[PDB]
């Protein structure tokens, strides 16, 4: 049971590092996604602002 | 865009047709 614990706690500790790996990636792609969102969005606003601003000429 | 399209060539008509008028105009007055 030691080692299984051993094994039972590192795998588990370990598997919590890729918990917060996935987790953390998780955020930043979300940061990125955001981030992308965000440059989308302001871009089709900044067009569809500017097109609005001249649709007429 | 159609609206840029079409309406500079709107303000752009407005040149042409108020030059085509001032031209027709002053070549009476």
């Given at each position: 049971?030691?080692?299984?614990?051993?094994?039972?706690?590192?795998?588990?500790?370990?598997?919590?590092?890729?918990?917060?790996?996935?987790?953390?990636?998780?955020?930043?792609?979300?940061?990125?996604?955001?981030?992308?969102?965000?440059?989308?969005?302001?871009?089709?606003?900044?067009?569809?602002?500017?097109?609005?601003?001249?649709?007429?000429? | 865009?159609?609206?840029?399209?079409?309406?500079?060539?709107m303000?752009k008509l407005?040149?042409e047709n108020?030059?085509?008028?001032?031209?027709?105009?002053?070549?009476?007055?």
């Amino acid at each position: 049971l030691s080692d299984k614990l051993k094994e039972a706690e590192t795998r588990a500790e370990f598997a919590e590092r890729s918990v917060t790996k996935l987790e953390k990636s998780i955020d930043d792609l979300e940061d990125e996604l955001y981030a992308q969102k965000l440059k989308y969005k302001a871009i089709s606003e900044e067009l569809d602002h500017a097109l609005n601003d001249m649709t007429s000429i | 865009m159609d609206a840029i399209k079409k309406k500079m060539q709107m303000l752009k008509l407005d040149k042409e047709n108020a030059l085509d008028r001032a031209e027709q105009a002053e070549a009476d007055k």
